[PDB]
Structures are given as C-alpha cells and as structure tokens.
C-alpha cells in the first residue's frame, strides 16, 4: 500500500504545574478543556486553547492513573493507585460516587460509548465492569494473569478489549462477561491499546512492537515496526495518525493504513530533570485532532501541532517497496 | 429469649443475661473468653432499648 502524506508534528506549548508524572489526560466532548491526572495525586482542569490552569481537584491519595469525561453526562470519572474509582459531578466539582472493589491499584478506565457503563482495569489483574448509576460491579472480567494495563470500550463485539502485562490481549463479550478470544502475539507487557474511529480495527502496543488487528476476528492485519522502546501510549487521529509514545522519551508518528513511520522524535525534558526522567506517560489527541496532548515523566503537559509550512515535497514519503 | 439464644449459640454460656437485661460473666474470664465474648453495638444497643 502506498502511504498518504501527513504533515510533521512540532512542539507548540509546554505546561508545567504538576508535581508528579502526568499519567492521565482526558478532553471534554466540546474540546474546551482537558484533564490531567498526575502523581501529585491531583486532577487539574486546563483550558485547551490558552493552556491556562482553570481548576485543581484533589480526591485521591495516590497517583491518578486514569480519567474520562462522559459525553452523555456532566460527570468526570477518575481512577488512581489508591484502589479507588470516583465519579465527580462537574456541576458541583465534588466526588459523588465511589466504585469500590479493586484489590490493588487501578491502572485504566474507559466508558462504554453507547450505554451507561464504566469499565476499569487493575493490578489485581482484572477488568471490572461497573454500572454508573447503581455503582454495582456487574461483571468481573477475569482470565488475565497479570496487571491489566490498558483497555478499550467499543460499540459492537468485542465490546471490551483488555491488554495486560502478562503479554496477552483478551477480547470480551460484554453481555456474558466471558472472553471470546485471546491474542498471544506480543512478547512482553501490552501497555497500550487504541481503536480506530472509522475503521473496525484496533492496535495494541508492547515493547518494540505495535500490532494492528481486525475486529471481531482478532485477525492480525499488520505490524508497526521500528519503535524499539517500551511503548506507553498510542493515539490515532481521524486522519489515520498513530502516536507511539515511549518510556525512554521516543515519539513515533505513523500512518495507520500502511504502517509507514512518517516521523520520529525525542521529546525534551524540563530544566532540572534527569536524563532518566525523559519519558512519555500519557497521550491523547483532542476531539478535533489538530492537537496532540502528551504528559511526560518530567511532570509536563506538552501540546503538539501539525506543521502547516511543510509541503508534500519538502517532506517526501521516503517509502521503499519490497 | 432472642438475646439468650444468641448468647448460647455462640457458646458464651459463662455470661448470664438476667431478666432486666444485664449481661454479667458468671465466673472469672480468661483472655480468650473475654475476647470471644466482647459483644457489639448492635447487641448492646438492642439490649438497652
């Protein structure tokens, strides 16, 4: 497949202000503000255009490892390493619900896109499916033998896909709460998952390998290769952009269809950070797709924009068919 | 009779519950007897009601 031309991405804005690594990031449906949860135990609400700090919320006693702003409800959900999943009422800026039951620290959190269900994944090795209204643990998706490090919700079968640190990826039928498949292609811990918005495909990332699969068969479609680092995140645009952020700090922008790596970067750390503290911990595109919000282990939110100056000729596709 | 059955089911017959609802040990208790016998706020609040 001949890849499409995508403009390269450059650093726009650097936002200091957390006192711990920025592990979570969640944009409003209306693209006005985004939410950074960080190791300083706090959730900060930042305006997306100006970048200014709007509010700080503290309800967790450990690092905030997950965020979600609901598109149907005026709620924001969070999870942390303190075994707690909380629902914040944004008409009051107060926690109104708890979702208790994870035996140890909770690493990921997603909302079902259609119906009012919250899925969280955790270091007790399990993905708990919760009802928002009654806070009742309707399903305990179990079968992984390690930490569930990432997770996606989907509008059709497989509705829940969980990636764990024992290197397997399980696809779960949500109605029965039992798995419809296991994908064991990854050699080490699958820290990242992402779902393409228009195609019925998804991608899982372990260290060194980003594999692209087809729903619902789980059919191995292709393999993003070249990013030889521990991949923490994954972010696809509407315009077929995969973002592999890596714990050593390495950034790779790929084209979703072909697999072509049209950009490779190393991010930059703040004044005062050690060279060990160079690393991407979280990333998400906004709702529009024009910006990429990354949160890094130098306690920093960074905004990345496409270069409008660059042409298809100034950065030609150096793709060699074989 | 309800509180008496609860006391006797837990094998705490060395506590006498009298007819004015006072729970007193009938003998000197060991440490294990005291630890097993300590009742709660539900029992004691119901007993005083």
């Amino acid at each position: 497949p001949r890849p499409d031309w995508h403009p390269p991405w450059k650093l726009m804005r650097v936002i200091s202000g957390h006192l711990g690594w920025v592990r979570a990031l969640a944009v409003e449906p209306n693209n006005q503000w985004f939410a950074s949860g960080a190791g300083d135990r706090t959730i900060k609400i930042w305006d997306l255009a100006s970048g200014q700090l709007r509010l700080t919320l503290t309800g967790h006693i450990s690092t905030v490892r997950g965020l979600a702003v609901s598109p149907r409800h005026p709620y924001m959900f969070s999870c942390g390493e303190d075994k707690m999943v909380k629902c914040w009422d944004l008409e009051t800026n107060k926690v109104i619900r708890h979702y208790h039951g994870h035996l140890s620290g909770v690493y990921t959190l997603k909302l079902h896109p259609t119906l009012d269900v919250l899925v969280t994944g955790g270091r007790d090795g399990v993905a708990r499916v919760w009802d928002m209204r009654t806070r009742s643990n309707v399903h305990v998706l179990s079968g992984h033998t390690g930490t569930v490090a990432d997770l996606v919700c989907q509008e059709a079968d497989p509705q829940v896909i969980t990636g764990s640190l024992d290197s397997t990826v399980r696809m779960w039928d949500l109605a029965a709460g039992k798995t419809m498949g296991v994908l064991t292609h990854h050699k080490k811990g699958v820290r990242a998952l992402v779902t393409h918005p228009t195609e019925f495909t998804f991608a899982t990332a372990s260290t060194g390998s980003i594999k692209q699969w087809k729903c619902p068969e789980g059919a191995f479609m292709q393999n993003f290769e070249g990013h030889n680092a521990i991949i923490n995140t994954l972010a696809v645009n509407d315009q077929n952009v995969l973002f592999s952020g890596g714990d050593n700090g390495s950034m790779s922008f790929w084209d979703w269809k072909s697999g072509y790596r049209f950009q490779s970067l190393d991010t930059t750390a703040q004044p005062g950070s050690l060279d060990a503290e160079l690393g991407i911990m979280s990333s998400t595109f906004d709702m529009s797709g024009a910006r990429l919000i990354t949160g890094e282990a130098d306690k920093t939110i960074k905004i990345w924009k496409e270069d409008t100056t660059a042409t298809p000729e100034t950065h030609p596709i150096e793709w060699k068919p074989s | 009779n309800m509180l008496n059955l609860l006391i006797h089911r837990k094998n705490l017959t060395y506590l006498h519950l009298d007819y004015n609802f006072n729970l007193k040990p009938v003998k000197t208790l060991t440490t294990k007897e005291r630890k097993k016998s300590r009742f709660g706020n539900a029992f004691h609040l119901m007993r005083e009601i």
Partner: protein, 48 residues
C-alpha cells in the same frame, strides 16, 4: 440503622465471616506501605 446492624450481625452468625471479601481502603495507617507496594510493582513491571 439497628435493623441493618442486627441483620449484618445475624449474617455473620448464620452464614459466616467473609474475611477478605472486599478490598480495604488505603487509610492513613496503610499509606506508606501501600506506596511501597505500588512502587515495587511498577519498578518490577519496567524491568520485566
């Protein structure tokens, strides 16, 4: 309150104690030990 308390008392009496059913919260006497648990798990995951 009291019928809830007496129902839970009779639940322990007649169906037993579920000793480690639901996760205990991280209260203030467990903060540093929990931070250690999570920290050691995270370092081990990065090495593996």
């Amino acid at each position: 309150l009291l019928e809830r308390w007496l129902g839970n008392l009779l639940s322990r009496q007649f169906e037993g104690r579920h000793s480690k059913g639901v996760a205990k919260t991280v209260t203030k006497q467990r903060v540093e030990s929990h931070f250690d648990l999570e920290l050691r798990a995270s370092v081990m995951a990065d090495l593996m």
